[PDB]
Amino acid sequence: QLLPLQKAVRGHVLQFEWHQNSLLTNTHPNFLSKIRNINVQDALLTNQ
Amino acid sequence: XXXXXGRXXXXXPXXXXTXXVTXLXXXXXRXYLRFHXXXYXXXXXXX
């Protein structure tokens, strides 16, 4: 008679455990970042 | 009463191992740096 309650509690703990191991780089492989171009200020700074 | 030959012994109350001891004489029976003075903008600023 307690079997389905055991299923419910197991499912709760397993939900928490699956959420703990989740990272955005795995689920969203096309995550963006902050690229920029080499510009004039880089060259001016190197000369200086 | 109990004083003996000039000694005032009067003021006294009168009324594992199990060693025995004699009564009346017991014996066995904050701040994080700002940019200046940290060595940049002291070698810099091509403007």
Coordinates of all heavy atoms in Angstrom, one line a residue, unseen atoms left out:
Chain A
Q1 N 0.8 -1.2 0.0 CA 0.0 0.0 0.0 C 0.8 1.3 0.0 O 0.3 2.3 -0.4 CB -0.9 0.0 1.2 CG -2.0 -1.0 1.2 CD -3.1 -0.7 0.2 OE1 -3.8 0.3 0.4 NE2 -3.3 -1.5 -0.8
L2 N 2.1 1.2 0.5 CA 3.0 2.3 0.4 C 3.7 2.5 -0.9 O 4.4 3.5 -1.1 CB 4.0 2.3 1.6 CG 3.4 2.6 2.9 CD1 4.5 2.6 4.0 CD2 2.7 3.9 2.9
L3 N 3.7 1.5 -1.7 CA 4.5 1.5 -3.0 C 4.3 2.8 -3.8 O 5.4 3.4 -4.2 CB 4.1 0.3 -3.9 CG 5.0 0.0 -5.1 CD1 5.0 -1.5 -5.3 CD2 4.4 0.7 -6.3
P4 N 3.1 3.3 -4.1 CA 3.1 4.6 -4.9 C 3.6 5.8 -4.2 O 4.2 6.7 -4.9 CB 1.6 4.7 -5.2 CG 0.9 3.9 -4.1 CD 1.8 2.8 -3.8
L5 N 3.5 5.9 -2.9 CA 4.2 7.0 -2.2 C 5.7 6.9 -2.3 O 6.4 7.9 -2.5 CB 3.8 6.9 -0.7 CG 4.5 7.9 0.2 CD1 4.2 9.4 -0.2 CD2 4.1 7.7 1.6
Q6 N 6.3 5.6 -2.3 CA 7.7 5.4 -2.6 C 8.0 5.9 -4.0 O 9.1 6.6 -4.2 CB 8.1 4.0 -2.4 CG 9.6 3.8 -2.4 CD 9.9 2.3 -2.6 OE1 9.4 1.7 -3.5 NE2 10.9 1.9 -1.8
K7 N 7.2 5.6 -5.0 CA 7.4 6.1 -6.3 C 7.5 7.6 -6.3 O 8.3 8.2 -7.0 CB 6.4 5.6 -7.3 CG 6.7 4.3 -7.9 CD 5.8 3.9 -9.0 CE 6.1 2.6 -9.6 NZ 5.2 2.2 -10.7
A8 N 6.5 8.3 -5.6 CA 6.5 9.7 -5.6 C 7.7 10.3 -5.0 O 8.3 11.3 -5.5 CB 5.2 10.2 -4.9
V9 N 8.2 9.8 -3.9 CA 9.3 10.4 -3.2 C 10.6 10.1 -4.0 O 11.5 11.0 -4.1 CB 9.5 9.8 -1.8 CG1 10.6 10.5 -1.0 CG2 8.2 10.1 -1.0
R10 N 10.7 8.9 -4.6 CA 11.9 8.6 -5.5 C 11.9 9.6 -6.6 O 12.9 10.1 -7.0 CB 11.8 7.2 -6.0 CG 12.2 6.1 -5.0 CD 11.9 4.8 -5.7 NE 12.5 3.7 -5.0 CZ 12.5 2.4 -5.4 NH1 11.8 2.1 -6.5 NH2 13.1 1.5 -4.7
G11 N 10.7 9.9 -7.2 CA 10.7 10.8 -8.3 C 11.1 12.2 -7.9 O 11.8 12.9 -8.7
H12 N 10.7 12.6 -6.7 CA 11.1 13.9 -6.2 C 12.6 14.0 -6.1 O 13.2 15.0 -6.7 CB 10.4 14.2 -4.9 CG 10.5 15.6 -4.4 ND1 10.9 16.0 -3.2 CD2 10.2 16.8 -5.1 CE1 10.9 17.3 -3.1 NE2 10.5 17.8 -4.2
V13 N 13.2 13.0 -5.5 CA 14.7 13.1 -5.3 C 15.4 13.0 -6.6 O 16.4 13.7 -6.8 CB 15.1 12.0 -4.3 CG1 16.6 12.0 -4.2 CG2 14.5 12.1 -3.0
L14 N 14.9 12.2 -7.6 CA 15.5 12.1 -8.9 C 15.4 13.3 -9.7 O 16.3 13.6 -10.5 CB 15.0 10.8 -9.6 CG 15.4 9.5 -9.0 CD1 14.9 8.4 -9.9 CD2 16.9 9.4 -8.9
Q15 N 14.3 14.0 -9.6 CA 14.1 15.3 -10.2 C 15.2 16.3 -9.7 O 15.9 16.9 -10.5 CB 12.8 15.9 -9.9 CG 11.6 15.4 -10.8 CD 10.6 16.5 -11.0 OE1 11.0 17.7 -11.4 NE2 9.4 16.2 -10.9
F16 N 15.4 16.4 -8.4 CA 16.4 17.2 -7.9 C 17.8 16.8 -8.4 O 18.6 17.7 -8.7 CB 16.3 17.2 -6.3 CG 17.3 18.2 -5.7 CD1 17.3 19.5 -6.0 CD2 18.2 17.7 -4.8 CE1 18.2 20.4 -5.4 CE2 19.1 18.6 -4.2 CZ 19.1 19.9 -4.5
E17 N 18.0 15.5 -8.4 CA 19.4 15.1 -8.8 C 19.6 15.4 -10.3 O 20.7 15.7 -10.7 CB 19.5 13.6 -8.6 CG 20.8 13.2 -8.0 CD 22.0 13.5 -8.9 OE1 21.8 13.2 -10.1 OE2 23.0 14.0 -8.4
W18 N 18.6 15.2 -11.2 CA 18.8 15.5 -12.6 C 19.0 17.0 -12.8 O 19.8 17.4 -13.6 CB 17.6 15.1 -13.4 CG 17.8 15.3 -14.9 CD1 17.6 16.4 -15.6 CD2 18.3 14.3 -15.8 NE1 17.9 16.2 -16.9 CE2 18.4 14.9 -17.1 CE3 18.8 13.0 -15.7 CZ2 18.9 14.3 -18.2 CZ3 19.2 12.4 -16.8 CH2 19.3 13.0 -18.0
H19 N 18.3 17.8 -12.0 CA 18.5 19.3 -12.1 C 19.9 19.7 -11.7 O 20.5 20.7 -12.2 CB 17.4 20.0 -11.3 CG 17.6 21.5 -11.4 ND1 17.0 22.2 -12.5 CD2 18.2 22.4 -10.6 CE1 17.3 23.5 -12.3 NE2 18.0 23.6 -11.1
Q20 N 20.5 19.0 -10.7 CA 21.8 19.4 -10.1 C 22.9 19.3 -11.2 O 23.8 20.2 -11.2 CB 22.1 18.6 -8.9 CG 21.7 19.2 -7.6 CD 22.5 18.6 -6.5 OE1 23.0 17.5 -6.5 NE2 22.6 19.4 -5.4
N21 N 22.8 18.3 -12.1 CA 23.8 18.1 -13.0 C 23.7 18.8 -14.3 O 24.3 18.4 -15.3 CB 23.9 16.6 -13.3 CG 24.3 15.8 -12.1 OD1 24.3 16.3 -11.0 ND2 24.8 14.6 -12.3
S22 N 22.8 19.8 -14.4 CA 22.5 20.5 -15.6 C 23.2 21.8 -15.8 O 23.3 22.6 -14.8 CB 21.0 20.7 -15.7 OG 20.4 19.7 -16.5
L23 N 23.8 22.0 -17.0 CA 24.5 23.2 -17.3 C 24.1 23.7 -18.6 O 23.6 23.0 -19.5 CB 26.0 22.9 -17.3 CG 26.6 22.7 -15.9 CD1 27.7 21.7 -15.9 CD2 27.2 24.0 -15.4
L24 N 24.2 25.1 -18.8 CA 23.6 25.7 -20.0 C 24.4 25.3 -21.3 O 23.9 25.2 -22.4 CB 23.5 27.2 -19.9 CG 22.1 27.8 -19.6 CD1 21.4 26.9 -18.7 CD2 22.3 29.1 -19.0
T25 N 25.8 25.1 -21.1 CA 26.6 24.8 -22.2 C 26.2 23.4 -22.8 O 26.5 23.2 -24.0 CB 28.1 24.8 -21.8 OG1 28.3 23.8 -20.7 CG2 28.5 26.1 -21.3
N26 N 25.6 22.5 -22.0 CA 25.2 21.2 -22.6 C 23.9 21.3 -23.3 O 23.7 20.7 -24.3 CB 25.2 20.2 -21.5 CG 25.2 18.8 -22.0 OD1 25.3 18.6 -23.2 ND2 25.0 17.8 -21.1
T27 N 22.9 22.1 -22.7 CA 21.6 22.1 -23.2 C 21.5 23.2 -24.3 O 20.6 23.0 -25.3 CB 20.6 22.4 -22.1 OG1 20.6 23.8 -21.8 CG2 20.9 21.6 -20.9
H28 N 22.2 24.3 -24.2 CA 22.2 25.3 -25.2 C 23.6 25.4 -25.9 O 24.4 26.3 -25.5 CB 21.8 26.7 -24.6 CG 20.4 26.8 -24.2 ND1 19.5 27.5 -24.9 CD2 19.7 26.2 -23.2 CE1 18.3 27.4 -24.3 NE2 18.4 26.6 -23.3
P29 N 23.9 24.5 -26.8 CA 25.3 24.5 -27.4 C 25.6 25.7 -28.2 O 26.8 26.0 -28.4 CB 25.3 23.3 -28.2 CG 24.1 22.5 -27.8 CD 23.1 23.5 -27.4
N30 N 24.6 26.5 -28.6 CA 24.8 27.7 -29.4 C 24.7 29.0 -28.6 O 24.3 30.0 -29.1 CB 23.8 27.8 -30.6 CG 24.0 26.6 -31.6 OD1 25.1 26.4 -32.0 ND2 22.9 26.0 -31.9
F31 N 25.2 28.9 -27.3 CA 25.2 30.1 -26.5 C 26.2 31.1 -27.0 O 27.3 30.7 -27.4 CB 25.5 29.7 -25.0 CG 25.0 30.7 -24.0 CD1 23.7 30.6 -23.5 CD2 25.8 31.6 -23.5 CE1 23.3 31.5 -22.6 CE2 25.4 32.5 -22.6 CZ 24.1 32.5 -22.1
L32 N 25.9 32.4 -26.9 CA 26.7 33.4 -27.5 C 27.7 33.9 -26.5 O 27.6 33.8 -25.3 CB 25.8 34.5 -28.0 CG 25.6 34.6 -29.5 CD1 24.4 35.4 -29.8 CD2 26.8 35.1 -30.3
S33 N 28.8 34.6 -27.0 CA 29.8 35.2 -26.2 C 30.2 36.5 -26.8 O 29.6 37.0 -27.8 CB 31.0 34.2 -26.0 OG 30.7 33.0 -26.5
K34 N 31.3 37.1 -26.3 CA 31.5 38.5 -26.5 C 32.6 38.9 -27.5 O 33.4 39.8 -27.3 CB 31.9 39.1 -25.2 CG 30.8 39.2 -24.2 CD 30.7 40.6 -23.6 CE 29.7 40.6 -22.5 NZ 29.7 42.0 -21.8
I35 N 32.7 38.2 -28.7 CA 33.7 38.5 -29.7 C 33.8 40.0 -30.1 O 32.8 40.7 -30.0 CB 33.4 37.7 -31.0 CG1 34.6 37.6 -31.9 CG2 32.2 38.2 -31.7 CD1 35.5 36.4 -31.6
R36 N 35.0 40.4 -30.5 CA 35.1 41.8 -31.0 C 36.2 41.7 -32.1 O 36.9 40.7 -32.3 CB 35.5 42.8 -29.9 CG 36.8 42.5 -29.2 CD 37.7 43.7 -29.1 NE 38.9 43.4 -28.4 CZ 40.1 44.0 -28.6 NH1 40.2 44.9 -29.5 NH2 41.1 43.6 -27.8
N37 N 36.3 42.8 -32.8 CA 37.3 43.0 -33.9 C 38.6 43.7 -33.4 O 38.5 44.6 -32.6 CB 36.7 43.7 -35.1 CG 36.0 42.8 -36.0 OD1 36.5 41.8 -36.4 ND2 34.7 43.2 -36.3
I38 N 39.7 43.4 -34.0 CA 40.9 44.1 -33.8 C 40.8 45.5 -34.5 O 40.4 45.5 -35.7 CB 42.1 43.4 -34.3 CG1 42.3 42.1 -33.6 CG2 43.4 44.2 -34.2 CD1 42.7 42.2 -32.1
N39 N 41.0 46.6 -33.8 CA 40.8 47.9 -34.3 C 42.0 48.8 -34.3 O 43.1 48.3 -34.1 CB 39.6 48.5 -33.5 CG 39.8 48.3 -32.1 OD1 40.8 47.9 -31.6 ND2 38.7 48.5 -31.3
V40 N 41.8 50.1 -34.5 CA 42.9 51.0 -34.6 C 43.5 51.2 -33.2 O 44.8 51.4 -33.1 CB 42.4 52.3 -35.2 CG1 43.5 53.4 -35.2 CG2 41.9 52.1 -36.6
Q41 N 42.7 51.2 -32.2 CA 43.3 51.5 -30.8 C 44.3 50.4 -30.4 O 45.2 50.8 -29.7 CB 42.1 51.6 -29.8 CG 41.4 52.9 -29.8 CD 40.4 53.0 -30.9 OE1 39.6 52.0 -31.1 NE2 40.3 54.1 -31.5
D42 N 44.1 49.2 -30.8 CA 45.1 48.2 -30.5 C 46.5 48.5 -31.2 O 47.5 48.4 -30.5 CB 44.6 46.8 -31.1 CG 43.7 46.1 -30.1 OD1 44.1 46.1 -28.9 OD2 42.7 45.5 -30.5
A43 N 46.5 48.9 -32.4 CA 47.7 49.3 -33.1 C 48.4 50.5 -32.5 O 49.6 50.5 -32.2 CB 47.5 49.5 -34.6
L44 N 47.5 51.5 -32.2 CA 48.1 52.7 -31.5 C 48.7 52.4 -30.2 O 49.8 52.8 -29.8 CB 47.0 53.8 -31.3 CG 46.3 54.3 -32.6 CD1 45.2 55.3 -32.2 CD2 47.3 54.9 -33.5
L45 N 48.0 51.5 -29.4 CA 48.5 51.1 -28.1 C 49.8 50.3 -28.2 O 50.8 50.5 -27.4 CB 47.5 50.3 -27.4 CG 47.8 49.9 -25.9 CD1 48.1 51.1 -25.1 CD2 46.7 49.1 -25.3
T46 N 49.9 49.4 -29.2 CA 51.2 48.7 -29.4 C 52.3 49.6 -29.7 O 53.4 49.5 -29.2 CB 51.0 47.6 -30.5 OG1 49.8 46.8 -30.2 CG2 52.2 46.7 -30.5
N47 N 52.1 50.5 -30.7 CA 53.2 51.5 -31.0 C 53.6 52.3 -29.8 O 54.8 52.4 -29.5 CB 52.7 52.4 -32.1 CG 52.3 51.7 -33.4 OD1 52.6 50.5 -33.5 ND2 51.7 52.4 -34.3
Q48 N 52.6 52.7 -29.0 CA 53.0 53.5 -27.8 C 53.7 52.6 -26.8 O 54.6 53.1 -26.1 CB 51.7 54.1 -27.2 CG 51.5 55.5 -27.5 CD 52.5 56.4 -26.8 OE1 53.1 56.0 -25.8 NE2 52.7 57.6 -27.4
Chain B
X1 N 39.8 22.5 78.9 CA 39.4 21.1 79.0 C 40.4 20.2 78.3 O 41.1 19.4 79.0 CB 38.0 20.8 78.6
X2 N 40.5 20.3 77.0 CA 41.4 19.6 76.2 C 42.8 20.2 76.0 O 43.7 19.6 75.5 CB 40.8 19.3 74.8
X3 N 42.9 21.5 76.5 CA 44.2 22.1 76.4 C 45.2 21.4 77.3 O 45.0 21.0 78.4 CB 44.1 23.6 76.9
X4 N 46.4 21.1 76.7 CA 47.5 20.3 77.4 C 48.7 21.2 77.5 O 49.4 21.4 76.5 CB 47.7 19.0 76.6
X5 N 49.1 21.5 78.7 CA 50.4 22.2 79.0 C 50.6 23.4 78.1 O 51.6 23.5 77.4 CB 51.5 21.2 78.9
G6 N 49.7 24.4 78.3 CA 49.9 25.6 77.6 C 49.5 25.6 76.1 O 49.5 26.7 75.5
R7 N 49.2 24.5 75.5 CA 48.8 24.4 74.2 C 47.2 24.5 74.1 O 46.5 23.8 74.8 CB 49.2 23.1 73.5 CG 50.7 22.9 73.8 CD 51.2 21.7 73.0 NE 52.7 21.7 73.0 CZ 53.5 22.5 72.3 NH1 52.9 23.4 71.5 NH2 54.8 22.5 72.4
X8 N 46.8 25.4 73.2 CA 45.4 25.7 73.1 C 44.8 24.8 72.0 O 44.4 25.3 70.9 CB 45.1 27.2 72.8
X9 N 44.6 23.5 72.3 CA 44.0 22.6 71.4 C 42.5 22.5 71.7 O 41.8 21.5 71.3 CB 44.6 21.2 71.6
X10 N 41.9 23.5 72.3 CA 40.5 23.5 72.8 C 39.5 23.6 71.6 O 38.5 22.9 71.5 CB 40.2 24.5 73.8
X11 N 39.8 24.6 70.7 CA 38.9 24.9 69.6 C 38.9 23.8 68.5 O 39.3 24.0 67.4 CB 39.3 26.3 69.0
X12 N 38.4 22.7 68.9 CA 38.2 21.5 68.0 C 36.9 20.9 68.2 O 36.3 21.0 69.3 CB 39.3 20.5 68.3
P13 N 36.3 20.3 67.2 CA 35.0 19.8 67.3 C 35.0 18.4 68.0 O 35.6 17.5 67.6 CB 34.5 19.6 65.8 CG 35.8 19.4 65.1 CD 36.8 20.2 65.8
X14 N 34.2 18.4 69.1 CA 34.1 17.2 70.0 C 32.7 16.8 70.1 O 31.8 17.5 70.5 CB 34.7 17.5 71.4
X15 N 32.4 15.5 69.7 CA 31.1 14.9 69.8 C 31.2 13.4 69.6 O 31.1 12.9 68.5 CB 30.2 15.5 68.8
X16 N 40.0 -1.2 43.2 CA 39.8 -0.2 44.3 C 40.5 -0.8 45.6 O 40.7 -2.0 45.7 CB 38.3 0.0 44.5
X17 N 40.8 0.1 46.5 CA 41.3 -0.2 47.8 C 40.7 0.7 48.9 O 40.7 1.9 48.7 CB 42.8 -0.1 47.8
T18 N 40.3 0.0 50.0 CA 39.8 0.8 51.1 C 40.8 0.9 52.2 O 40.8 0.3 53.2 CB 38.5 0.0 51.6
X19 N 41.8 1.8 51.9 CA 42.8 2.2 52.9 C 42.2 2.9 54.0 O 41.1 3.5 53.9 CB 43.9 3.0 52.2
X20 N 42.8 2.8 55.2 CA 42.3 3.4 56.4 C 43.2 4.5 56.8 O 44.4 4.3 56.9 CB 42.2 2.4 57.6
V21 N 42.7 5.7 57.1 CA 43.4 6.9 57.4 C 43.1 7.3 58.8 O 41.9 7.3 59.2 CB 43.1 8.0 56.4
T22 N 44.1 7.8 59.6 CA 43.8 8.3 60.9 C 43.1 9.6 60.8 O 43.5 10.5 60.1 CB 45.1 8.5 61.7
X23 N 42.0 9.8 61.6 CA 41.3 11.0 61.7 C 42.2 12.0 62.5 O 43.2 11.6 63.2 CB 40.0 10.9 62.3
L24 N 41.9 13.3 62.3 CA 42.6 14.4 63.0 C 44.0 14.6 62.4 O 44.6 15.7 62.6 CB 42.7 14.1 64.5 CG 43.3 15.0 65.5 CD1 44.8 14.7 65.7 CD2 43.1 16.5 65.2
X25 N 44.6 13.6 61.7 CA 45.8 13.7 61.0 C 45.8 12.6 59.9 O 46.2 11.5 60.3 CB 47.0 13.7 61.8
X26 N 45.4 12.9 58.7 CA 45.2 11.9 57.7 C 46.5 11.2 57.3 O 47.3 11.8 56.6 CB 44.4 12.4 56.5
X27 N 46.7 10.0 57.7 CA 47.8 9.1 57.3 C 47.3 7.7 57.3 O 46.5 7.3 58.1 CB 49.0 9.3 58.1
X28 N 47.9 6.9 56.4 CA 47.5 5.5 56.3 C 47.9 4.7 57.6 O 49.1 4.6 57.9 CB 48.2 4.9 55.1
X29 N 46.9 4.2 58.3 CA 47.2 3.6 59.5 C 47.9 2.3 59.4 O 48.0 1.7 58.3 CB 45.8 3.3 60.3
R30 N 37.7 44.7 3.3 CA 38.1 46.0 3.8 C 38.3 47.1 2.7 O 37.4 47.8 2.3 CB 39.3 45.8 4.6 CG 40.0 44.5 4.4 CD 41.1 44.6 3.3 NE 41.8 43.3 3.2 CZ 42.7 43.1 2.3 NH1 43.0 44.1 1.4 NH2 43.3 42.0 2.2
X31 N 39.5 47.1 2.2 CA 39.9 48.1 1.2 C 40.6 47.4 0.0 O 41.5 46.6 0.2 CB 40.8 49.2 1.7
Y32 N 40.0 47.5 -1.2 CA 40.6 47.0 -2.4 C 41.1 48.1 -3.3 O 40.5 49.1 -3.4 CB 39.6 46.1 -3.1 CG 38.7 45.4 -2.1 CD1 37.3 45.6 -2.1 CD2 39.2 44.4 -1.2 CE1 36.5 45.0 -1.2 CE2 38.3 43.8 -0.4 CZ 37.0 44.1 -0.4 OH 36.1 43.4 0.5
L33 N 42.2 47.8 -4.0 CA 43.0 48.9 -4.5 C 42.3 49.6 -5.7 O 41.6 49.0 -6.5 CB 44.4 48.3 -5.0
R34 N 42.5 50.9 -5.8 CA 42.1 51.7 -6.9 C 43.2 51.8 -7.9 O 44.3 51.4 -7.7 CB 41.6 53.1 -6.4 CG 42.3 53.6 -5.1 CD 42.5 55.1 -5.1 NE 43.1 55.5 -3.8 CZ 44.4 55.3 -3.5 NH1 45.2 54.7 -4.3 NH2 44.8 55.7 -2.3
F35 N 42.8 52.3 -9.1 CA 43.6 52.1 -10.3 C 45.0 52.7 -10.2 O 46.0 52.1 -10.6 CB 42.9 52.6 -11.6
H36 N 45.1 53.9 -9.7 CA 46.3 54.6 -9.6 C 47.3 53.9 -8.7 O 46.9 53.1 -7.8 CB 46.1 56.0 -9.1
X37 N 48.6 54.1 -8.9 CA 49.7 53.5 -8.1 C 49.7 52.0 -8.1 O 50.4 51.4 -7.3 CB 49.6 54.0 -6.6
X38 N 48.9 51.4 -9.0 CA 48.9 50.0 -9.2 C 49.6 49.7 -10.6 O 49.4 48.5 -11.1 CB 47.5 49.4 -9.2
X39 N 50.3 50.6 -11.2 CA 51.2 50.4 -12.3 C 50.4 50.2 -13.6 O 50.7 49.4 -14.5 CB 52.1 49.3 -12.1
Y40 N 49.3 51.0 -13.8 CA 48.8 51.2 -15.2 C 48.1 52.6 -15.2 O 47.8 53.1 -14.2 CB 47.8 50.1 -15.6 CG 47.5 50.2 -17.1 CD1 48.5 50.2 -18.0 CD2 46.2 50.4 -17.5 CE1 48.3 50.2 -19.4 CE2 45.9 50.5 -18.9 CZ 47.0 50.4 -19.8 OH 46.7 50.5 -21.1
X41 N 48.0 53.1 -16.4 CA 47.8 54.5 -16.6 C 49.0 55.3 -16.1 O 48.9 56.5 -15.8 CB 46.5 55.1 -16.0
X42 N 50.1 54.6 -16.0 CA 51.4 55.2 -15.6 C 52.4 54.7 -16.7 O 53.6 55.0 -16.6 CB 51.9 54.8 -14.2
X43 N 51.9 53.9 -17.6 CA 52.6 53.4 -18.8 C 51.8 53.4 -20.1 O 52.0 52.5 -20.9 CB 53.2 52.0 -18.6
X44 N 50.8 54.3 -20.2 CA 49.7 54.1 -21.1 C 49.1 55.3 -21.7 O 49.8 56.3 -21.9 CB 48.6 53.4 -20.3
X45 N 47.8 55.2 -22.1 CA 47.0 56.3 -22.6 C 47.5 56.9 -23.9 O 47.9 58.1 -23.9 CB 46.9 57.4 -21.5
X46 N 47.5 56.2 -25.0 CA 47.9 56.7 -26.3 C 47.0 57.8 -26.8 O 47.1 58.2 -28.0 CB 47.9 55.5 -27.3
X47 N 46.1 58.3 -26.0 CA 45.3 59.5 -26.4 C 46.0 60.7 -25.9 O 46.1 61.7 -26.6 CB 43.9 59.4 -25.8

